[PDB]
Design a protein around this nucleic acid. Sequence first.
RNA 1: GAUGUCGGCUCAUCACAUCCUGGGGCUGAAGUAGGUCCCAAGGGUAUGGCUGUUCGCCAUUUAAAGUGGUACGCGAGCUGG
RNA 2: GGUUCUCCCCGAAAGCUAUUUAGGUAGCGCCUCGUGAAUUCAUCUCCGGGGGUAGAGCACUGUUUCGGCAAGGGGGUCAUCCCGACUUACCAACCCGAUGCAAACUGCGAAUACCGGAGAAUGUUAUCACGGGAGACACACGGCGGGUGCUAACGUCCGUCGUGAAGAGGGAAACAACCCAGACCGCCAGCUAAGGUCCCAAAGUCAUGGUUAAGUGGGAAACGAUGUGGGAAGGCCCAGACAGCCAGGAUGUUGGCUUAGAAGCAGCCAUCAUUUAAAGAAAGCGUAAUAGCUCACUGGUCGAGUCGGCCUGCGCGGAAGAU
Lengths: 38, 141, 176, 136, 94, 164
Amino acid sequence: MKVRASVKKLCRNCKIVKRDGVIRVICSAEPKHKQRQG
Amino acid sequence: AKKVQAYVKLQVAAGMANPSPPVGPALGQQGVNIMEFCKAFNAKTDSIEKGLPIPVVITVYADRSFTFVTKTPPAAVLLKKAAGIKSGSGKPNKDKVGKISRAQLQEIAQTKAADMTGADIEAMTRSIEGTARSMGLVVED
Amino acid sequence: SRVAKAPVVVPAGVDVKINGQVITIKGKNGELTRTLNDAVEVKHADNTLTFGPRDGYADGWAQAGTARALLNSMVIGVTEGFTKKLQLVGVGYRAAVKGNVINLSLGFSHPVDHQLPAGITAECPTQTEIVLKGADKQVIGQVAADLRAYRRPEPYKGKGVRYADEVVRTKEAKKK
Amino acid sequence: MLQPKRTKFRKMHKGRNRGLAQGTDVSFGSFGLKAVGRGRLTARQIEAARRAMTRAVKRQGKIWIRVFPDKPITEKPLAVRMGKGKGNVEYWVALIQPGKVLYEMDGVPEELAREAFKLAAAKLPIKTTFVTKTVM
Amino acid sequence: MFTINAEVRKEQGKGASRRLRAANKFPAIIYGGKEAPLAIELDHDKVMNMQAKAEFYSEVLTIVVDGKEIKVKAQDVQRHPYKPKLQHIDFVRA
Amino acid sequence: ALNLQDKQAIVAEVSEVAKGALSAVVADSRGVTVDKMTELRKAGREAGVYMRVVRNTLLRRAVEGTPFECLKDAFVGPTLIAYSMEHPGAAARLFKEFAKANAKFEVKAAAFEGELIPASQIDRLATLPTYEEAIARLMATMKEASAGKLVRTLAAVRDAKEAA
RNA sequence: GAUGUCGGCUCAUCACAUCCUGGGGCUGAAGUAGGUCCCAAGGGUAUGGCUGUUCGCCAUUUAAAGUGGUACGCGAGCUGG
RNA sequence: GGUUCUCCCCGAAAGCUAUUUAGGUAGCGCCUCGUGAAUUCAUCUCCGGGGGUAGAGCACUGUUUCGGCAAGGGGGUCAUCCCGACUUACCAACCCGAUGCAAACUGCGAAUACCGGAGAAUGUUAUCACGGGAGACACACGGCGGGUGCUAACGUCCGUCGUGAAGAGGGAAACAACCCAGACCGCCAGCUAAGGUCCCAAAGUCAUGGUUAAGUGGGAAACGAUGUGGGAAGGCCCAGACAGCCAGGAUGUUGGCUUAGAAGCAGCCAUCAUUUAAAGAAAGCGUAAUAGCUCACUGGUCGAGUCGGCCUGCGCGGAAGAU
């Protein structure tokens, strides 16, 4: 992970979810895609 | 994702499936014993050319049940053999390095037939034309 | 929205006790299998669960499927009881339950304090085979979740505690 | 960069906008990029935008340019106070105003042009919009 | 393709035009033939979702206004300074 | 609406031949597995029997637009369909060629020369005798469907009501 | 009608955009070891030279050798080349 | 630097022009007491009169780019030195048409402002002569608009204007320079403005409808996504969707070459052909790579939404400092 800003879809299994006030990437193709902010 | 695919593909040259890196891990992973496949596979390579990729087919289901296919040699192997060529042109359509008549082609179509889907012995012949065209064989009437 | 229109149709001898917003699912072979809907208002009817808007909220379809999924989940929960066979891969760890404590290693000299929720029980055939027991579909996956929490299946050599859907996609080691 | 061959004189007024544009529609191309509102471009943006469009589209069509830097703009050096004459000439500015179309294309497939103009907009200091000419 | 309706202008001027745009209405005009141009107000979000399809301009239009029907086709569009929304459209008789 | 004419066309193509058939055999697989389908197409050009894999949408719309005989109860669910208008015994042998590489209990029903053929009964028709015994078996099939069937059908409905 | 300045000590204090241990994701990370890496104000954070001296340049300590402000902290405390 | 009691009537300027001149002094505009004496001086209505800015535009001037082009440039070229030349395959102008732009450009040009007449109204002179008394030149936060500066700055200046300067009170977490308004004094009277309406602290936890779940509200931009809801028009669309869960995920064929193996996914050449209710020689991922996967599309299980465009509400992180 990199913390970043602005969220994009890295793979077809990034679900992309708004958890509290921060958009989280949770993925089920690779754990690699888990960007903390969008 | 559940992560299941049925009828998984594997691809290895005819004389290199005695060592494990050309076979990769997968044939072992769906529970098809590598020794029994290695012994069945060898029975069919004395007429197959070395370095030419032979199809091997494994199935896994969601409940970890598995089924396994070994196939009669490719139409590509027979089409090189019958025209007396070792390997293909390496350029599809425009480069010609030989020829195959239709009357031989129909015998090949009949030799691959349990894998071939075609509803006609002609429909099956029409499918192997474009394989002969990739390897630089011209299909003459 | 496709799943806020499913009419559920609960089976016969299943007791579905509606307190208005609190719903309690009872029947033979389990106890305390329940759901609380808080964004949407939920009707039972006779058995055909009917979904509609709750006072002080504005969102639509969004939680109305969630409710459908959560009430049906509990109806599968009391009847048969949700799936139970849990297990883990990777040497010297274990996942042997002893009472209210689950014993595993991370090499630490403190207790890991992996502990059982008040909703579950367990027993073990072997020190790496676990049978988790209950009739609420959430609590079996909640204790499953604390047990995998720092022994999740790694994306490189794969070792970890294995339950439900899993993020590992496999890679092979580097050549030697 | 797009730049003038020549200009009448070397230092010219900054100018300003009153808050409207009249060349709002696409008319020279068959699709383009509108500025939405207002601001300044240092010719540095035109260039950044042209790079962006040519690397995605490459030799597919031509680009038509609708923005032009007719004004030179001076900077006051840090060592000079105000009220000691106008600065040295620094960069050339196009003054952009609400609804001005910036960049157009027509020869290149419309979707290949569409993706080229989304890329080009990030190089820009303000939020923008794709316009297509259409039938009328 | 589309069969639409209009009213002949109740209110005219800039001030008047903004008070139609306040209510999500706009103005237009239908010119051509041997006869006068017919000034109308339209409704703004009735035509915006038509002209997403090319048929508003490619095929002729039924516009019924004060019981007159003459058949009409679209022309070039005037748009607001930072909105794609229609400020005003022209039409020719067909 | 349809997007295609194809979805309405294929209903007509299937209806024409399956209404037409002198023997057909109606079977279940729901995703046949390609290996089994390719071998059955191999054997279909041998017997001159034709075979289709087909959606339960087509069959429900087919029953609505067209009446079908002795095959129409077997249209419930996922279905593959083999059918011949000519050499009827060979039609019943192709399901017995498919039984070699798959389960034989998957047939729901059949018709043979207009007769209702139950799941067990089709396995004997599908035995396919050499030619003197074939013409004789084809005549027995036909004598049954003419005059044996009349009483038989009137009987099959009284067994369903009888309760244990 | 300016409370009178740089340097160095004493004695500090507050902001965290944390020098470091600490819990955790990815890794082109197998493990050891690292890169990448989020949380985090709690706590510890050296000395001698030359020069007026921070800085410079050097030698050395420590697991480690931090960032920012304070009438550029502090002569109604001390001290100017 | 400092200037000692009070009342009342009236009440500036900070621009112009010179300075051995810029915190000075003078003339002038402006302020007032006095005698003189014209409604002079004002608005809007209508009559008479004039304009070149804003905006807008590209014939013109300096141009703008696409195309057409006299021409200019680049590059290949001919034998009998030499002079000369048959010979465009290509770039981009003045112009030409269309498109952008400006102050030293203008084919085009408002609103308002102005004057002197004719009409309504009101203003204890706004304006006018000359004698006496000056003051300001060291004006500012802001509206319209421009120069200048980074269309920074509690920045700086002018044409034009308010307020304060030279006016109390109401409103920012008191407040005349900002918004409202014009403090003669007295009234435990009422109303209303800008501003406010749970408590702090004077009034709406308003009546009807939409929407967010962030303390956004009530702190700003780029940017971005399958964050979230409403609406009409439209393709798919109960004849089966969306495509989950299951099952298919194909035939030649998981193609040829290359190679360790070389899958569509290391690379290149394939850029095609086959039955099918159906499955691309593949949109995205991954030991770099042998491998494995999601994935549309097909059909069950089974029986309803779903996506591209646009109008519209609401979010997100981006938004880290001496106390």
